[PDB]
Structures are given as C-alpha cells and as structure tokens.
C-alpha cells in the first residue's frame, strides 16, 4: 500500500471460442488442382428396361 | 485460360438404375432343355366322399 496496491495474480481465464466442424463431414474428399476449373460428367443409365 | 480453360476432371457419376431380382426368389428351379415343350401331369383324388 501507499505507493501502490500489492496484488496476487490468480490464473488467467482464457475463453477460446471456436466453430467446430460439422458440415465438412459430408465433404471428405479433397482435391488440390491447379487447372482453371473443375468439371463433372454425370451419366444416367436406364438399365431397367425389359 | 485465355484460349480455352483448363479443366480438372472429378470422377464420373453414374445413375445406374438396375431392376433387382425380387419375384425370381420364388422361381429357384432352373431347367435348360432342348425339347420343344415342358409338360406336367396334375392329379386330383378326392378320397373324402361318404
């Protein structure tokens, strides 16, 4: 006291808030590609005919 | 780019619609035959009259 109030520091209270991954469980496949665009070819095959 | 964009292909997608074997579960016997026809004899014998 007098010059300055003495202190005890008790431990720091770190709240690290995060956004845990949920939707990325349905995007498991990863592609790293340098080409300009990605492309899909989707095919329908009606093999149900008699 | 410029002339024509480079593309990275992802795997092809195939809506391959089969028609699964359901009724054929009740047709388990197979007969391969070269005779012109197949024939059955069916006999009804009512031994239940007084």
UniProtKB/TrEMBL annotation, chains A, B:
It comes from the Viruses. It is found in: Virion; Host cytoplasm. Belongs to the lambda phage major capsid protein family. Homomultimer. Assembles to form an icosahedral capsid. The assembly is primed by the interaction between capsid assembly protease and portal dodecamer, and major capsid proteins assemble cooperatively to form the procapsid with the help of capsid scaffolding protein. Major capsid protein forms hexons and pentons of the icosahedron. Viral genomic DNA is packaged into the procapsid through the portal vertex. The packaging triggers a dramatic reconfiguration of the capsid shell. This is Major capsid protein. It comes from Chivirus chi.
């Amino acid at each position: 006291a007098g010059l300055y109030t003495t202190y005890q520091l008790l431990e720091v209270q770190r709240k690290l808030k995060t956004l845990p991954a949920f939707f990325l469980q349905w995007f498991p496949r990863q592609i790293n590609f340098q080409e300009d665009m990605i492309a899909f070819d989707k095919v329908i095959q009606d093999v149900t005919r008699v």
